[PDB]
């Protein structure tokens, strides 16, 4: 189905392919961007510890602060995903 | 010019009108959503302490965790703004 493109990453190379997995499952399951975003957020809070934040959309700009090595931003198809750890 | 609509807020009623100000100035100054977002982020990091995160866009869903009383989400015209404190 969808094509994973990483645009900016500061994160273990494994957690990246992991972040794509959690998102690919989320895209397969949910439709609303808010919903997709909670799935990913919750899964990362579960696996790696709190506190993840996730933004899912086709149009937004961001400026966030993230703990070192805990930040990814990528596209799955035409939806884009921002997933960082701060808190 | 633009019409400020608050959609969800957990934040002092004053910091809200403040968040609209920081955004209205940001919209007047910058054009790219990423840029607008950094202006607001940086200003809040300045006034109220670290650590703010800001998302600016016309299309995105979010799921974040924020410190109590440090969260706003609102529209300025057709752009929407998410501004929370976690970290």
């Amino acid at each position: 189905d969808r094509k994973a493109v990483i645009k900016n990453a500061d994160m273990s190379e494994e957690m990246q392919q992991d972040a794509v997995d959690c998102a690919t499952q989320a895209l397969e399951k949910y439709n609303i961007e808010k919903d997709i975003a909670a799935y990913i957020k919750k899964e990362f809070d579960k696996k790696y510890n709190p506190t993840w934040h996730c933004i899912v959309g086709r149009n937004f700009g961001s400026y966030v602060t993230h703990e070192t090595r805990h930040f990814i931003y990528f596209y799955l198809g035409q939806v884009a995903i921002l997933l960082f750890k701060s808190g | 010019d633009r019409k400020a609509v608050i959609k969800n807020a957990d934040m002092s009623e004053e910091m809200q009108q403040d968040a609209v100000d920081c955004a209205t100035q940001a919209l007047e100054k910058y054009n790219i959503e990423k840029d607008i977002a950094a202006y607001i982020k940086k200003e809040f990091d300045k006034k109220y302490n670290p650590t703010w995160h800001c998302i600016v866009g016309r299309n995105f869903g979010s799921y974040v965790t924020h410190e109590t009383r440090h969260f706003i989400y609102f529209y300025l015209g057709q752009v929407a703004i998410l501004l929370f404190k976690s970290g």
Partner: peptide, 9 residues
């Protein structure tokens, strides 16, 4: 701890 700007294409 670092900081990142991101913008959709």
């Amino acid at each position: 701890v670092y900081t990142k700007q991101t913008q959709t294409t």
